[PDB]
Design a protein around this ligand. Structure first.
Ligand SMILES: *[C@@](C)(CO)[C@](*)(O)[C@H](Cc1ccccc1)NC(=O)[C@H](Cc1c[nH]c2ccccc12)NC(=O)[C@@H](C)NC(=O)CN1CCOCC1
Ligand SMILES: [Mg+2]
Ligand SMILES: [Mg+2]
Lengths: 231, 195, 235, 240, 222, 211, 233, 244
């Protein structure tokens, strides 16, 4: 109200409204789902178009051979943050000959987002990210919020109507975690999960976007007729 | 570059400058004009290190032309020469000084007098009836000391200038490929096409 | 007052949303992509008859294989065009090749959100970036001040955009020829324009693989206008 | 440093600071530009509220940017000096780096760019100035006349006016100026420029300034008596 | 006084076939009269069907290769996983080298692969960035030993057709990959004999449309 | 190297050798020392190969940007000046470059010499490189404005040959160009080895050499 | 640009079937003065890596601190710091190599020659060299300074190529290293009798031996040597 | 943050005016009147000190008339402290020109420079403008005797006669009436004092409430002399013209 003019101002109840408004941008964004087993990690994203003449906005970005994310909210902010991750993954490889741990990647995103919430002039990031990866401690899935909060999860979903997919994963927890050494079945579970967040529209060939990473699988994105198999 | 001469007569200033440009052991050009018009009644000839000369001259030309447009007024030769001197005096203590020597020949329309200024790369300014830079003065100043009068005509000034070039052509080991001569008077700047 | 980079309660940047309103006031620009080329057309909209219309430059070359049309506060586009031209030629310097239309568009859109308290406000202009490369063929992009860019088969921006976009919705198909696309831009421009469309107050352009980006002459466009009139009168 | 964003968008998609700068231009004295077949004439209004003025030394309304290009304006006088200085510096900077004088179109594009930059830079306000830029490109006999404004947009004009009561003189020019046959001579071009100012000026004494620019850097400013002869001839024909 | 440069020896060789290319180099690394390693790889697969070797000062060589491999990675990120063509890689490397015009990478660089028409391609660089496409090139310590041999046995220089006596040249018939590898092996065996910094091992990288293949051969260890 | 270029009635001829050296070792037998900046602009190369390639390819970028901004080809005079200004930024930093910017513009055919010192000279005829003195000898005695395109191409070709013969650091092959108002025209790569024997027989020159 | 003041001499090392061995004497020389006699030049990093350093001791102590700080930094927000995400020899080396090359590129080098010896997660042997120029190389045997000239020849007789590594036992490898250290004591004027030796095995882990002495030295034959040519008494 | 407290000194009003410049001009209208009159053979500068005290040391006091160099002087109207900041800058600018070109700075060039500094404070920086209006009286060999004025907007104009400060409307009307082109310095002195005597808010115009100065070619042969009048000399010229 009087305490939402900038990010540097706490409300009387200890809330940061600009951060909460940035969180709101994520809820307006299109749905995306993340889930993992012990061998593989999968991202599934519902792409959004402007109209019938337009293309479908890309949702998934590659950060390294072993790491990538899906976005929901302001796409340019995802480009800035994914660029930062690319650089950090790359710094770890060039200097230490070491693939960046997914947990550490999350800690770096948290700290970068945090600086924008405590300083005058700037603004919080208006995007939420689901980071998947495979490192020395196996498969991982992270959820990033522009408040700074980063959370390691078995599965999750963000965006509009994301609660439906999140409930499904909460039921299926014991099943999909055990899907080891079977990428197609893990993607199926993800496609079935994101389907719980659909209304009116359904999953078409140029609508659906899928990405996967695992033990002997580099981060690869599937679009177009490559996802027709899963429709 | 090498030889640049100047002489101030009754009603004009005459500048003579060599045409040769050398690179390595080869004369690349024998028609080079080592001068820039700073204003309608002010001419500057130059000589020094390769590249620095033209860059400095054009930089000065741009500054004087800028002043002329801003004030709708031509600076006096004296004012121009002082500006040039300061730029060179500023330059000599820089990281990389500009190694350029100049003669500024101008006709002051206010005083109705020709004026010749000699400025070296250190910023050493002197007003003279006749001047030169480098080794040029070693050969020519004795002739000028002898023959020069302040009431000389432009034609007589050219004849005395021919005699100076003939002496240079005889006693210098250097082939400078003749000179381009330019006259600065009340009517402006013109080039003597046959010399 | 309030921050320039402030979020609204709905999760939108106030300034970005307000710049979009400025673009709605701009003159109409239309782009149509085909397999034979991409056509770009604009409404010139001279404020007075004494204004020499040929000086109105709302269609612009970025490279030989990339063209651009603008709508909104057209003065804001000059630095965007300058950056685009620099990016296009710089990539040619670094990689000895033409730059991808998408990559060029992405470079322009990176400028968009570089504002705060960098420039003091977002751009007040939208761009239709049309071009061709070997990888993805003939392409048409719509670059906004939000930093977002969508690819389009056909797109209209400016004051008559939503009316033109609905018309493009019906008319566009994947087998359109270049000649058909030219007449289609002229048709839709003539529809949404206030004044009567002629060769002096409207401008056409195209990008083909062979000839590259070309702005059409007034004599060439005049014939296409006369060809349009006759074919509409044919039924 | 002072970084405050002064020029910003409003809910309806307007930049008020840029629009208020146009109001400063509206307040400024009238300036007019007319191009003939082989010349361009720049007319300027001088408000007669200020007498006891020294016309020798008072800043003239038309300013030479180079020997072949001139610039007149309407709006804040102090703001116009900054643009003129920058333009003059750029004109010499172009000659120095490219070895050709600026084209009229290039000089206009630069001045317009400066005006635009001051609409999306922190800590600064827009120029309260619109300019008319006229001249002839080097080794070209085609007349050139451009206009700029605070937003940074620019365009070419057969004839144009800016400043206070510009709406009226533009009305006059739109009906009197024929594109198929423009003022063939200098006389006809000046006559039309004076006529257009006489619609607004008040008295035709020291209130009208005229500057004729011809090809090949031939720029002259008319005197009071020369202009007064045009004023006399116009009204004598009008008495009929 | 500190000397930031050093010489790690070695020699490299690139040959462009009709539909293939090879980049070979010895595996010996040295300082002065000592051997550091008998097997220290010098020719690298940089991705996109491009091989590269920066011969001279190993620290600068490793840094340049590392930076180009990085340049390939960022080319994929920035331009939608587009394949970096050999000509584009060459121009990119020029700019990497010239960025240190006033403190140069002390290396002679060669890359090899296939052009956009599928034909064999070899590009050669000097330490400051001048480059050019070629058919044949030896670089490094024994470069002057090997190049004349290749002018003779690859481009048939100073060879004419018997009977004509200098009137008709030997026609420039193309070479197979098996024929090229023979010339490479003989080139390095000969260089090993007369150059003290060449020996230990030979590693050859062969590039075809099918990918990048490796072949290793022992060399004299003295 | 040896490079030359000269103006004449039908435009400008441009001829260069193709040798590259690293000390006494011939590093390259065939290196291109001409750059096609645009269909109406050429640039010759002499000195440090790296410097020549980098700065002339950067000139092309800047010349290309000129066309996009102004919708018109850059003049030869302006292009040469941009290059000389680049050289003036790295004043005394050790750059080694000597080039001739050759082209056709509105003023007709244009030819400018530019070097690492910043020197910029307009002229009818120029020659750069270690073998420039040998080329000048042939050019000065046989040059006319009234030359035919055929005879002019031969003169530039023959002048490089003279230098390639005598100068140890010049040779390999001759690259010929002819600049017209419709643009430049490539007139091929000519091996000096073969060209020498051909010229010797047909012309009767090089009598002292046995063949 | 500087000059080395207090220096450490040769560092020698080799691979064997199950791991690597590395050794270096305990001397800190000040030119020709044998100034400091209790200097440790082998520095363990965790339980899987030993970094051996020769050259300037002040720069060695600086590197020693960088490594100590590297371990501290790796443990930050890292639950697997003593397991899967522990520091590897390859990580430690590449870090140092990056630092060395950067410092030489600023014309302000760390005046050292370094050998990083260890065993990776997968049991693979790691042995790589880096110096003040940023030059890196790997080999079955590695040695710095005088060791390169005298030790390598002896160690290469045991492991001449890659295929000899599985055939070499820890007892044979240690014996070769200890003999090399004796030879260096005979012939290097800037060396000492006292030295340290470290063994990093994939089975038995890190064994760090201190206060070792060169023994079984041959000097008796010196009594018979008289004069420099013609002298008999 | 800090934005909350920013007055925004450099913005347009909806009518296209600069708020702070207009308000600065309002400040200046309360300042003591200063008058400049240009004649064929010289220039007069007359100014009124504001409500003084008997205990003010007048002979060592200076609040209105300042010397920029030997050829150019200024009369001040507004904040004195603000004026001194600008005056010292102008003094330096004149010496920079003299050092560079070895000639005394032309009057207009000096005026333009100061006016450009004032202009800058209205367009950028976020600082308040200088609350000062100058009358420049000077001489050079190009245009001879010259009068200029500048105000906080940074706009400057040339004049035959001009007033700044309080009651300029009334003062300008009186000057416009009695001024003629063939006028001389002695006549201009009388006109300046008569105008102040009629426009003043004080009961009577006395020597202790005035600062006065002339720029005359009335110096021995072709040269110019600046005369800053002393208290006793102002008292004498008041008696001579018949005011006291
Ligand atoms: C004569 C041959 C002079 O020797 C020419 O000027 C020639 C000019 C030239 C220009 C562009 C491309 C090729 C050649 N210059 C050289 O060949 C030049 C001579 C040279 C060598 N060091 C120099 C230092 C300062 C000035 C000139 C120098 N040679 C080079 O620049 C060498 C280092 N470059 C190459 O040999 C280029 N290599 C690229 C990879 O392929 C093999 C050749
Ligand atoms: Mg001197
Ligand atoms: Mg040996």
């Amino acid at each position: 109200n009087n305490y939402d003019g900038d990010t540097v101002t706490f409300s009387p109840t200890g809330r940061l409204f600009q951060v909460e408004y940035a969180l709101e941008a994520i809820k307006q964004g299109s749905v995306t789902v993340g889930l993992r087993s012990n061998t593989h990690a999968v991202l599934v994203a519902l792409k959004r178009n402007a109209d019938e003449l337009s293309s479908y906005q890309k949702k998934i970005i590659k950060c390294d051979e072993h790491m990538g994310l899906s976005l929901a909210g302001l796409a340019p902010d995802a480009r800035v943050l994914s660029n930062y991750l690319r650089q950090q993954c790359n710094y770890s490889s060039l200097v230490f000959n070491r693939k960046l741990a997914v947990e550490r990647a999350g800690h770096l995103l948290c700290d970068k987002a945090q600086k924008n919430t405590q300083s005058y002039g700037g603004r919080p990031y208006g995007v939420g990210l689901l980071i998947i990866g495979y490192d020395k401690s196996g498969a991982h899935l992270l959820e990033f919020q522009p408040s700074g909060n980063v959370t390691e999860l078995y599965g999750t979903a963000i965006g509009a109507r994301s609660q439906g997919a999140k409930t499904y994963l909460e039921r299926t927890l014991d099943t999909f975690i055990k899907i080891d050494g079977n990428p197609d079945e893990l993607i199926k579970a993800g496609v079935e999960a994101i389907s719980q967040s659909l209304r009116d529209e359904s999953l078409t060939v140029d609508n659906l976007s899928i990405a996967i990473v695992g033990k002997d699988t580099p981060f690869t994105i599937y679009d177009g007729e490559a996802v027709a198999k899963y429709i | 570059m090498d030889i640049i001469l100047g002489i101030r007569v009754q009603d004009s200033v005459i500048l003579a400058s060599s045409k040769a440009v050398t690179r390595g052991i080869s004369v690349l050009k024998d028609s080079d004009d080592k001068t820039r018009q700073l204003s309608p009644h002010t001419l500057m000839s130059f000589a020094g290190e390769a590249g620095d000369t033209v860059q400095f001259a054009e930089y000065i030309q741009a500054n004087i032309q800028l002043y002329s447009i801003r004030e709708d007024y031509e600076l006096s030769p004296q004012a121009v020469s002082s500006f040039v001197r300061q730029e060179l005096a500023k330059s000599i203590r820089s990281r990389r000084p500009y190694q350029v020597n100049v003669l500024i020949g101008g006709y002051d329309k206010k005083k109705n007098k020709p004026e010749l200024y000699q400025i070296d790369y250190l910023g050493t300014k002197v007003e003279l009836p006749y001047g030169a830079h480098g080794y040029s003065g070693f050969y020519t100043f004795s002739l000028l000391d002898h023959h020069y009068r302040p009431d000389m005509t432009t034609e007589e000034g050219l004849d005395l200038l021919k005699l100076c070039v003939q002496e240079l052509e005889k006693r210098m080991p250097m082939d400078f490929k003749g000179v381009i001569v330019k006259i600065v008077d009340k009517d402006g700047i013109r080039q003597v096409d046959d010399f | 007052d309030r921050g320039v980079s402030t979020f609204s309660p709905e999760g939108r940047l106030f300034q970005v949303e307000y710049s979009l309103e400025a673009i709605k006031l701009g003159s109409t620009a239309i782009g149509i992509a085909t397999k034979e080329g991409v056509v770009l057309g604009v409404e010139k909209r001279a404020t007075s008859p004494l204004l020499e219309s040929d000086s109105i430059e709302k269609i612009v070359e970025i490279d030989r294989h990339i063209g651009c049309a603008m709508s909104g506060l057209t003065a804001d586009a000059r630095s965007m065009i300058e950056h685009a031209r620099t990016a296009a030629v710089t990539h040619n310097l670094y990689y000895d090749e033409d730059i991808n239309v998408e990559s060029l568009t992405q470079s322009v859109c990176d400028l968009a959100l570089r504002f705060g308290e960098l420039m003091s406000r977002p751009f007040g202009v939208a761009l239709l970036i049309a071009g061709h490369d070997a990888d993805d063929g003939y392409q048409l992009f719509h670059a906004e001040p939000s930093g977002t860019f969508y690819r389009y088969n056909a797109k209209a921006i400016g004051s008559g955009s939503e009316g033109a976009q609905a018309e493009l919705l019906n008319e566009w198909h994947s087998s359109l020829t270049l000649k058909e696309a030219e007449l289609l831009v002229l048709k839709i421009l003539k529809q949404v324009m206030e004044e009567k469309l002629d060769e002096n107050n409207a401008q056409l352009s195209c990008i083909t693989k062979q000839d590259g980006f070309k702005i059409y002459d007034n004599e060439k466009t005049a014939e296409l206008i006369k060809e349009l009139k006759e074919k509409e009168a044919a039924e | 440093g002072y970084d405050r964003a002064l020029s910003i968008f409003s809910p309806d998609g307007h930049i008020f600071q840029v629009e208020y700068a146009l109001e400063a231009v509206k307040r400024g004295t009238c300036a007019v530009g007319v191009k003939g077949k082989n010349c361009v004439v720049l007319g300027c209004e001088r408000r007669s509220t200020l007498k006891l003025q020294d016309t020798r030394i008072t800043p003239s309304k038309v300013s030479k940017i180079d020997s072949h290009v001139v610039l007149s304006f309407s709006g804040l006088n102090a703001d116009s000096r900054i643009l003129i200085e920058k333009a003059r510096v750029e004109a010499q900077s172009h000659r120095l780096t490219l070895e050709d004088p600026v084209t009229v179109e290039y000089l206009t594009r630069y001045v317009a760019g400066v005006q635009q930059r001051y609409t999306q830079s922190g800590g600064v306000r827009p120029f309260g100035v619109s300019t008319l830029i006229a001249g002839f490109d080097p080794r070209d006999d085609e007349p050139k006349l451009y206009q700029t404004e605070p937003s940074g947009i620019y365009s070419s004009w057969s004839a144009q006016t800016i400043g206070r009561n510009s709406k009226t003189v533009r009305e006059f020019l739109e009906k009197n100026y024929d594109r198929k046959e423009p003022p063939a001579t200098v006389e006809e071009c000046v006559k039309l420029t004076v006529r257009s100012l006489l619609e607004v000026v008040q008295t035709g004494a020291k209130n009208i300034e005229i500057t004729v620019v011809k090809p090949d850097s031939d720029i002259v400013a008319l005197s009071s008596e020369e202009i007064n002869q045009y004023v006399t001839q116009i009204e004598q024909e009008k008495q009929e | 006084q500190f000397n930031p440069y050093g010489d790690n020896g070695g020699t490299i060789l690139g040959i462009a076939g009709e539909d293939f290319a090879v980049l070979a180099g010895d595996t010996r690394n040295i300082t002065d009269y000592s051997i550091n390693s008998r097997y220290e790889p010098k020719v690298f697969d940089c991705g996109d069907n491009i091989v590269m070797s920066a011969n001279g000062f190993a620290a600068d060589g490793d840094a340049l290769v590392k930076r180009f491999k990085n340049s390939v990675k960022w080319y994929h990120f920035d331009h939608n996983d587009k394949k970096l063509s050999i000509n584009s890689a060459a121009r990119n490397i020029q700019h990497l080298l010239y960025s240190r015009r006033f403190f140069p990478y002390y290396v002679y660089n060669i890359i090899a692969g296939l052009d956009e028409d599928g034909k064999g391609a070899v590009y050669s660089f000097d330490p400051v960035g001048s480059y050019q496409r070629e058919q044949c090139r030896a670089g490094g310590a024994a470069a002057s030993l090997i190049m004349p041999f290749l002018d003779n046995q690859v481009n048939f220089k100073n060879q004419y057709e018997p009977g004509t006596n200098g009137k008709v040249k030997k026609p420039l018939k193309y070479l197979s990959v098996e024929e090229v590898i023979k010339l490479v092996r003989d080139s390095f065996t000969s260089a090993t004999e007369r150059h003290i910094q060449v020996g230990d091992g030979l590693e050859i990288l062969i590039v075809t449309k099918d990918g990048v293949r490796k072949e290793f051969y022992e060399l004299k260890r003295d | 190297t040896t490079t030359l270029a000269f103006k004449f009635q039908h435009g400008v001829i441009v001829a260069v050798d193709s040798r590259a050296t690293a000390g006494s070792y011939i590093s390259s037998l065939r290196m291109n020392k001409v750059i096609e900046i645009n269909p109406y602009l050429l640039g010759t190369m002499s000195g440090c190969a790296a410097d020549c390639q980098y700065w002339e390819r950067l000139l092309a970028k800047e010349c290309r940007l000129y066309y996009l901004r102004n919708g018109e080809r850059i003049s030869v005079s302006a292009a040469s000046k941009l290059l000389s200004n680049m050289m003036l930024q790295y004043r005394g930093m050790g750059l080694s470059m000597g080039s001739m910017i050759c082209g056709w513009d509105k003023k007709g055919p244009g030819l400018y010499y530019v070097d690492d010192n910043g020197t910029r000279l307009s002229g009818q005829m120029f020659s750069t490189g270690s073998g420039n003195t040998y080329a000048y000898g042939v050019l000065d005695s046989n040059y006319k404005w009234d030359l035919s395109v055929e005879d002019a191409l031969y003169l530039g070709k023959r002048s490089i040959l003279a230098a390639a013969h005598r100068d140890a650091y010049s040779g390999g092959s001759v690259n010929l160009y002819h600049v017209t108002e419709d643009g430049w025209i490539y007139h091929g790569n000519h091996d000096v080895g073969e060209l020498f024997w051909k010229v010797k027989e047909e012309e009767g020159s090089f009598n002292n050499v046995i063949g | 640009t500087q000059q080395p003041i207090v220096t450490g001499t040769s560092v020698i090392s080799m691979k064997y079937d199950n791991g690597v061995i590395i050794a270096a004497d305990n001397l800190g020389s000040y030119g020709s003065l044998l100034r400091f006699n209790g200097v440790e030049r082998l520095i363990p990093v965790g339980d899987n890596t030993v970094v051996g350093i020769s050259g300037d001791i002040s720069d060695m102590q600086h590197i020693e601190r960088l490594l100590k700080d590297l371990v501290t930094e790796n443990a930050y927000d890292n639950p697997l710091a003593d397991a899967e995400e522990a520091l590897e020899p390859s990580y430690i080396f590449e870090y140092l190599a990056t630092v060395m090359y950067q410092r030489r590129s600023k014309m302000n080098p760390l005046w050292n020659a370094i050998i990083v010896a260890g065993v990776q997660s997968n049991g693979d042997q790691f042995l790589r060299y880096v110096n003040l120029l940023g030059v890196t190389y790997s080999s079955p045997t590695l040695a710095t300074g005088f060791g390169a000239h005298m030790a390598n020849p002896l160690l290469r007789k045991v492991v001449d190529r890659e295929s000899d590594i599985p055939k070499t036992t820890v007892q044979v490898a240690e014996e070769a290293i200890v003999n090399a250290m004796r030879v260096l004591y005979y012939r290097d004027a800037r060396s000492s009798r006292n030295f340290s030796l470290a063994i990093i095995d994939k089975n038995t882990g890190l064994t760090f031996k201190k206060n070792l002495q060169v023994e079984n030295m041959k000097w008796d034959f010196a009594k018979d040597i008289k004069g420099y040519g013609t002298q008999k008494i | 943050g800090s934005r909350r407290y920013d007055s925004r000194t450099t913005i347009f009003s909806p009518e296209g005016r600069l708020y702070q410049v207009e308000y600065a001009l309002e400040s200046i209208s309360h300042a003591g009147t200063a008058i400049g009159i240009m004649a064929s053979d010289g220039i007069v500068l007359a100014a009124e000190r504001k409500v003084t005290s008997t205990l003010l040391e007048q002979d060592t006091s200076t609040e209105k008339l300042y010397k920029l160099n030997d050829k150019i002087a200024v009369a001040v109207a507004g904040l004195t402290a603000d004026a001194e900041i600008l005056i010292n800058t102008a003094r330096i600018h004149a010496q920079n020109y003299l050092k560079t070109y070895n000639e005394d700075i032309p009057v207009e060039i000096l005026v333009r420079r100061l006016s450009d500094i004032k202009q800058g404070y209205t367009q950028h920086g976020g600082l308040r403008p200088f609350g000062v209006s100058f009358i420049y009286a000077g001489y050079d060999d190009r245009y001879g005797y010259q009068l200029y004025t500048s105000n906080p907007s940074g706009n400057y104009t040339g004049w035959k006669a001009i007033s700044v400060g309080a009651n300029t409307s009334a003062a300008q009307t009186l000057l416009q009436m009695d001024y003629k082109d063939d006028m001389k310095v002695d006549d201009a002195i009388e006109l300046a004092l008569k105008t102040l005597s009629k426009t003043t808010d004080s009961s009577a115009l006395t020597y202790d409430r005035l600062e006065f100065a002339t720029i005359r070619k009335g110096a021995n042969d072709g040269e110019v002399y600046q005369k800053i009048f002393k208290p006793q000399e102002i008292k004498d010229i008041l008696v001579k013209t018949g005011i006291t």
